[PDB]
């Protein structure tokens, strides 16, 4: 006689969208490893670290519905005077001060993190499309050591 | 023969609203784990700790009814002179003193906890929207060790 | 010398049952967070909202005593013509009208809230079993805004 | 012209103690959900069910006043021959027979419910301390189905 | 033949009001567990303990009738010199001395317990509203151990 | 002198089973990211989306006890007419309609979500074994945009 | 025409400590998934299962205040003769017997669950520190199948 | 003076086996780039694309323990009628239809993806052994453009 | 005595396209070793290093379907004023500044990295076709030493 | 009119350090594939398997700040008698016994896993520096087949 035991649980996460493309499963909750940055490279305000690239992949694109796609990021800004700099948020202690994360468009332009200002439009082709971005650290002062983790959501506009 | 025994009770909680969006079930009552903070980071008044991000998810958004959403938080302030600092409340003993909780906007601005001063408006898309916030500890003096638990309710304004 | 002071009180709640399985401590009294629902989704009678899943966990199951389990829910119906829709009950004022809670079986069929009509039988395995259910809002008319809280007890039948 | 109506009443419950620690507001009157237990598990005297853990939280502990804390529980024993078994009590009818509740301390030893025999001492740290316990059903014979509710008060000894 | 026996009695408590909102059934008569407090935290007059939060919920709010709501608490003061401190009352013996309960506004300001000095007004939204408050112990001298129970009635002003 | 402060809490979850294999810790509560799907790919009933693979890993397998393993999934069906289609459940609002999740066996056959109909048996080897599965979206009508989250438990049969 | 509706509630949990480091928000309350274990691996007393690693992260460490950190765990022991074995507690039924959870030091030594016997000290660096641990199942007899859930709180000693 | 900072984490993955050979580190988890294939090469059922070879390397082979080795692959089939065709799985959208991946033996024979039908045996020499294989696209109908990613695990049999 | 052990996993990567040609498996994801370049060759804006050639190979070309092929590259530009220069992206630190990668057509003309400005058309022959490119470093200012890694995706046009 | 849909979430991980070098993004969290090892190569205690090398890359090194770098690893030891061998930790079942992972220095010396015993200092040049390391399996007895996964965090010291 066979032996039957309890197993576990499987959670399925997904979304149904009425749009020309569908975001790839690996690009909806991706994690970008920025690495470590020295405080000597963020000594004063306006100092930028090196960039780390990341992609947002669109699947099952149909050019008849739409020909261009744009991405707008949404997140908590570091302060009112820096709308284009993400705020670090990992825990109540241990986070770096006067440091933020800047998301750069494919044209090298900073993106406002309001979820309304969309990036430059990219021409789409049928099938799989990759939208390139890169992120870097931005200093609004004299950086102090600590953890630098940031979170941001994005929305895709099809034209 | 079948055997029937008393099983238990199930309680359903929810709300019906006349609005452009509906708050997600995971956002109507959520716990934000701030973590521990050292007293050395809250030695004097105006000292702040590192931020912890939390989001309020809006489901079934219809942009034809409203295109913007704002959130105003309501809670007990630590004192009259600090209307934007939440007051710690867990028990009659063991709570930290001269330190509160600040809820920061998506633009990095502190929010008044009166339930009338709403945050910055965020553009809404059809379907799911994720309004970002972050919370941090704010010292109104020399903070002393103890538990730091705070509670606040929020309203959503659609325009 | 030792200082002895009064502490408090501890209340133990439980049940001894002559049955093949025992309901888990987390399932005898659980709160299901349905979330918010827009009035636009309950404009007319027969309209349903999105579903929220909840589980009833059975512990110490012995397949030699019984191989199948069924659950029947008992609650106050919204009206005589709808003996499958739970009536909202939180207070004398502030509750939503023309809308109730429907409990859906693991086959997607609505369950009669009379405590006698049991759901479909589910095969049991030795040890832990997790019976899945589904809850959603059901409109018997044009719903109006207000709190939507409902309660229902359940009983388990072992065969 | 404002309208003023009668709102209701608020009752405040608490205690002022002269001790090294203060019991948390969530631990002065707490409900422990044991769940359901099968009669097949409690078939003869000495049979025990599975354990359900619960904690007594101490706040504002001052190590310089006392370094150790112990807890003694007080309740009605099931009979004279079983001083470590809590008697079930809820209503004149419907309670289980030949089964009680046993309280075990951090070392796994059953505690006498006389309010004088204290559990093993636990070293205290400054601030919040959590004293762990667990409860289980104990059979003094062939258990019969029924409700199993027990009540017990505790006192804290600081050394 | 059916058997009919006497059951019991059901008492319904409520109130009909002519106001913009109705107090929730869970807020008209609620119990606030403050927990325990050490005498070392109330050694001299003016010393305060940690705060415990409690809420007054308003249902069926109509903004078109009134937009603001305030709460005034009424109770017995500890003495003529401390009109903002609630007096303890549980029995003729066993109550703490030189200790009282202070009810704090959402702005952190102590409320006069005369039933005429209303709290700060809070903006009301249509439907459910939650008015936050804090409760804490206040020392008018050297605190002595004992039970600390207080009672206060409140009234709501709609403007 | 050393400084001791309160830390936190650690919760251990697991199961002891009498079976030839034990489910790996990474497979008991795994989350499967399906990604986004366009409504154009689910225009009518019977339409299927692309599949996403996931695995259930069995550890410490002993071929002397059992040589084959099978998995049966248990969940709430979308309706009585589609017993092999999982129902979406995330919140009361914002979920896709007429869309479900199908779990596909290693032979490409859809599995009935009743917890009794097991998949095909897979030959086991000593040590680690990986059971492959597939998940995809199934349309029972004309799909509408919204969140698509599904939950299902499974049990393993060793023969 | 702005529309304002009730949202929900946000609960903030945290602690203010006077210590060289602060426990990370992800480590104050974490869940360790041990997975399933076969009864054949726990046939007699002294038998152990495979270990599952977990970490306690310390943030904002200041080496000038303290150079070493140690962790002591506090929980209910399985019995008097096994002070280093955690007792299983999930419900009154369905828990495994004669098997517990052992917390292992970074040197591979079992830790006493009394909250006083601290682990080996670990040298701290400025910023983030990760203290490694692993947990495993320990049999005090012939283990029987069932749920195996354990809970333990920990303290951090800075010296 | 030395400066000490937190570096990062390293994960080690491997297996201990009781076998005559051990799979190379580069063969336990390898990616095979199949390239692109035109839809015009998979117009009807049974059409095959060009093949791409891949190898499984066995290290530390001992001919005194076993002289031959065979490999059986395990994965999800495209359908019931094609047990030798691997199903594509990358995301819910954008995957190709009516086309799968076919794994070929060293004798040009298709392998059943059930994990039990082992390939042809190959003579082993002491030291390093390479087992050649071939992968290609197989059409079960009219192939449509899209991403074509497949995953399969393999077992090695020594006899 | 046949011994069976777990071998590992194999991942297959590929794409099905509807086009006159198919990209070689060696060209879908290739790494171009640019080598080292002295900062003395990139002193000012407009300075270029030596070119390193790389090819994109097309297979199974059908001249009947299409006779010409063009390639457009997509990547993150270094800045808005230089849309023809790729941005360096390897990590948050150690990357060169004021240096970028320029992809040159077979005619010696720099290609815009917008993913829509295709290169010069090249006549295709039946079978295998090679489309040649070359890459070089471009200075937008005074070059500083550091790692120089860039990534870019490309699309092929058959018209 | 453009269509806007919710895209997903992006998580950024990184650290800001006050040090002469920054760890590369690919080295802060890397996976080392040790491959498979035969039990015949770990027959008795002190037996070692073949070594698998891995590197830790340092970026933006400034020799004017520090000239030498050393790495110390931290992890759970297999036992108290072997404070140089990493303990295996993947799940409660299926892990190998009497065998661990040894991290070897660039001089061939095993490193203590206490997080304080640093490796040999390596001369640093400006720009990119790679610190070579080795990993192998160490037997503390008669190794048994099973999964062999280990985790260790490292830490860099600059002089």
mmCIF file of N, CA and C in Angstrom, chain I residues 53-104:
data_model
loop_
_atom_site.group_PDB
_atom_site.id
_atom_site.type_symbol
_atom_site.label_atom_id
_atom_site.label_comp_id
_atom_site.label_asym_id
_atom_site.label_seq_id
_atom_site.Cartn_x
_atom_site.Cartn_y
_atom_site.Cartn_z
ATOM 1 N N UNK I 53 37.199 44.088 -33.583
ATOM 2 C CA UNK I 53 36.109 43.621 -34.420
ATOM 3 C C UNK I 53 35.365 42.446 -33.804
ATOM 4 N N UNK I 54 34.050 42.433 -34.014
ATOM 5 C CA UNK I 54 33.202 41.321 -33.620
ATOM 6 C C UNK I 54 32.134 41.124 -34.685
ATOM 7 N N UNK I 55 31.670 39.886 -34.818
ATOM 8 C CA UNK I 55 30.760 39.503 -35.886
ATOM 9 C C UNK I 55 29.448 38.982 -35.318
ATOM 10 N N UNK I 56 28.386 39.134 -36.104
ATOM 11 C CA UNK I 56 27.085 38.539 -35.823
ATOM 12 C C UNK I 56 26.767 37.600 -36.977
ATOM 13 N N UNK I 57 26.551 36.326 -36.664
ATOM 14 C CA UNK I 57 26.385 35.295 -37.677
ATOM 15 C C UNK I 57 24.915 34.929 -37.831
ATOM 16 N N UNK I 58 24.471 34.835 -39.082
ATOM 17 C CA UNK I 58 23.105 34.460 -39.416
ATOM 18 C C UNK I 58 23.106 33.116 -40.131
ATOM 19 N N UNK I 59 22.192 32.238 -39.732
ATOM 20 C CA UNK I 59 22.134 30.881 -40.250
ATOM 21 C C UNK I 59 20.809 30.631 -40.956
ATOM 22 N N UNK I 60 20.829 29.655 -41.867
ATOM 23 C CA UNK I 60 19.640 29.224 -42.604
ATOM 24 C C UNK I 60 18.978 30.390 -43.333
ATOM 25 N N UNK I 61 19.797 31.266 -43.910
ATOM 26 C CA UNK I 61 19.271 32.424 -44.619
ATOM 27 C C UNK I 61 18.598 31.998 -45.917
ATOM 28 N N UNK I 62 17.399 32.523 -46.152
ATOM 29 C CA UNK I 62 16.648 32.285 -47.380
ATOM 30 C C UNK I 62 16.552 33.606 -48.132
ATOM 31 N N UNK I 63 17.250 33.696 -49.266
ATOM 32 C CA UNK I 63 17.247 34.928 -50.048
ATOM 33 C C UNK I 63 15.878 35.237 -50.638
ATOM 34 N N UNK I 64 15.023 34.225 -50.806
ATOM 35 C CA UNK I 64 13.678 34.471 -51.316
ATOM 36 C C UNK I 64 12.858 35.303 -50.338
ATOM 37 N N UNK I 65 12.962 35.006 -49.041
ATOM 38 C CA UNK I 65 12.190 35.746 -48.047
ATOM 39 C C UNK I 65 12.710 37.172 -47.914
ATOM 40 N N UNK I 66 14.029 37.337 -47.834
ATOM 41 C CA UNK I 66 14.630 38.655 -47.712
ATOM 42 C C UNK I 66 16.039 38.614 -48.285
ATOM 43 N N UNK I 67 16.477 39.752 -48.827
ATOM 44 C CA UNK I 67 17.785 39.853 -49.454
ATOM 45 C C UNK I 67 18.768 40.734 -48.697
ATOM 46 N N UNK I 68 18.294 41.575 -47.780
ATOM 47 C CA UNK I 68 19.155 42.474 -47.027
ATOM 48 C C UNK I 68 18.881 42.320 -45.539
ATOM 49 N N UNK I 69 19.918 42.553 -44.737
ATOM 50 C CA UNK I 69 19.814 42.469 -43.288
ATOM 51 C C UNK I 69 20.498 43.673 -42.663
ATOM 52 N N UNK I 70 19.889 44.206 -41.606
ATOM 53 C CA UNK I 70 20.448 45.327 -40.868
ATOM 54 C C UNK I 70 20.318 45.052 -39.378
ATOM 55 N N UNK I 71 21.223 45.638 -38.600
ATOM 56 C CA UNK I 71 21.291 45.420 -37.160
ATOM 57 C C UNK I 71 21.239 46.770 -36.461
ATOM 58 N N UNK I 72 20.374 46.881 -35.456
ATOM 59 C CA UNK I 72 20.295 48.058 -34.601
ATOM 60 C C UNK I 72 20.594 47.643 -33.170
ATOM 61 N N UNK I 73 21.504 48.364 -32.525
ATOM 62 C CA UNK I 73 21.909 48.061 -31.163
ATOM 63 C C UNK I 73 21.137 48.930 -30.181
ATOM 64 N N UNK I 74 20.883 48.374 -29.000
ATOM 65 C CA UNK I 74 20.149 49.067 -27.951
ATOM 66 C C UNK I 74 20.933 48.980 -26.652
ATOM 67 N N UNK I 75 21.130 50.125 -26.009
ATOM 68 C CA UNK I 75 21.861 50.168 -24.756
ATOM 69 C C UNK I 75 21.720 51.529 -24.117
ATOM 70 N N UNK I 76 22.260 51.638 -22.907
ATOM 71 C CA UNK I 76 22.211 52.887 -22.160
ATOM 72 C C UNK I 76 23.322 53.811 -22.645
ATOM 73 N N UNK I 77 22.947 55.005 -23.095
ATOM 74 C CA UNK I 77 23.934 55.980 -23.527
ATOM 75 C C UNK I 77 24.637 56.592 -22.319
ATOM 76 N N UNK I 78 25.860 57.071 -22.550
ATOM 77 C CA UNK I 78 26.632 57.670 -21.465
ATOM 78 C C UNK I 78 25.982 58.968 -20.999
ATOM 79 N N UNK I 79 25.438 59.749 -21.931
ATOM 80 C CA UNK I 79 24.759 60.999 -21.611
ATOM 81 C C UNK I 79 23.881 61.391 -22.796
ATOM 82 N N UNK I 80 22.988 62.356 -22.552
ATOM 83 C CA UNK I 80 22.027 62.758 -23.577
ATOM 84 C C UNK I 80 22.723 63.359 -24.793
ATOM 85 N N UNK I 81 23.778 64.144 -24.571
ATOM 86 C CA UNK I 81 24.490 64.790 -25.668
ATOM 87 C C UNK I 81 25.302 63.813 -26.507
ATOM 88 N N UNK I 82 25.477 62.574 -26.049
ATOM 89 C CA UNK I 82 26.237 61.553 -26.771
ATOM 90 C C UNK I 82 25.379 60.303 -26.905
ATOM 91 N N UNK I 83 24.412 60.305 -27.828
ATOM 92 C CA UNK I 83 23.547 59.126 -27.993
ATOM 93 C C UNK I 83 24.226 57.955 -28.681
ATOM 94 N N UNK I 84 25.426 58.141 -29.226
ATOM 95 C CA UNK I 84 26.130 57.100 -29.962
ATOM 96 C C UNK I 84 27.201 56.409 -29.129
ATOM 97 N N UNK I 85 27.263 56.684 -27.829
ATOM 98 C CA UNK I 85 28.322 56.182 -26.961
ATOM 99 C C UNK I 85 27.688 55.342 -25.861
ATOM 100 N N UNK I 86 28.135 54.095 -25.738
ATOM 101 C CA UNK I 86 27.630 53.206 -24.701
ATOM 102 C C UNK I 86 28.196 53.588 -23.338
ATOM 103 N N UNK I 87 27.390 53.377 -22.301
ATOM 104 C CA UNK I 87 27.801 53.667 -20.936
ATOM 105 C C UNK I 87 28.427 52.438 -20.292
ATOM 106 N N UNK I 88 29.469 52.664 -19.497
ATOM 107 C CA UNK I 88 30.117 51.581 -18.771
ATOM 108 C C UNK I 88 29.296 51.207 -17.544
ATOM 109 N N UNK I 89 29.155 49.900 -17.308
ATOM 110 C CA UNK I 89 28.315 49.419 -16.211
ATOM 111 C C UNK I 89 28.810 48.035 -15.784
ATOM 112 N N UNK I 90 29.574 47.993 -14.700
ATOM 113 C CA UNK I 90 30.015 46.729 -14.117
ATOM 114 C C UNK I 90 29.729 46.626 -12.627
ATOM 115 N N UNK I 91 29.877 47.719 -11.884
ATOM 116 C CA UNK I 91 29.691 47.719 -10.439
ATOM 117 C C UNK I 91 29.576 49.164 -9.981
ATOM 118 N N UNK I 92 29.242 49.337 -8.702
ATOM 119 C CA UNK I 92 29.102 50.673 -8.136
ATOM 120 C C UNK I 92 30.431 51.405 -7.992
ATOM 121 N N UNK I 93 31.557 50.701 -8.075
ATOM 122 C CA UNK I 93 32.866 51.316 -7.925
ATOM 123 C C UNK I 93 33.858 50.651 -8.866
ATOM 124 N N UNK I 94 34.912 51.390 -9.209
ATOM 125 C CA UNK I 94 35.991 50.868 -10.017
ATOM 126 C C UNK I 94 35.853 51.078 -11.508
ATOM 127 N N UNK I 95 34.727 51.606 -11.978
ATOM 128 C CA UNK I 95 34.546 51.837 -13.402
ATOM 129 C C UNK I 95 35.207 53.140 -13.832
ATOM 130 N N UNK I 96 35.617 53.184 -15.097
ATOM 131 C CA UNK I 96 36.225 54.381 -15.650
ATOM 132 C C UNK I 96 35.178 55.473 -15.853
ATOM 133 N N UNK I 97 35.649 56.717 -15.880
ATOM 134 C CA UNK I 97 34.794 57.879 -16.065
ATOM 135 C C UNK I 97 35.191 58.613 -17.339
ATOM 136 N N UNK I 98 34.196 59.232 -17.977
ATOM 137 C CA UNK I 98 34.356 59.958 -19.237
ATOM 138 C C UNK I 98 34.797 59.048 -20.380
ATOM 139 N N UNK I 99 34.555 57.744 -20.258
ATOM 140 C CA UNK I 99 34.902 56.770 -21.285
ATOM 141 C C UNK I 99 33.654 55.975 -21.638
ATOM 142 N N UNK I 100 33.497 55.667 -22.923
ATOM 143 C CA UNK I 100 32.383 54.866 -23.380
ATOM 144 C C UNK I 100 32.804 53.972 -24.525
ATOM 145 N N UNK I 101 31.877 53.116 -24.947
ATOM 146 C CA UNK I 101 32.104 52.163 -26.026
ATOM 147 C C UNK I 101 31.279 52.595 -27.228
ATOM 148 N N UNK I 102 31.916 52.654 -28.392
ATOM 149 C CA UNK I 102 31.257 53.030 -29.635
ATOM 150 C C UNK I 102 31.233 51.833 -30.573
ATOM 151 N N UNK I 103 30.042 51.473 -31.043
ATOM 152 C CA UNK I 103 29.862 50.372 -31.980
ATOM 153 C C UNK I 103 29.805 50.951 -33.385
ATOM 154 N N UNK I 104 30.644 50.432 -34.275
ATOM 155 C CA UNK I 104 30.823 50.991 -35.605
ATOM 156 C C UNK I 104 30.272 50.045 -36.661
#
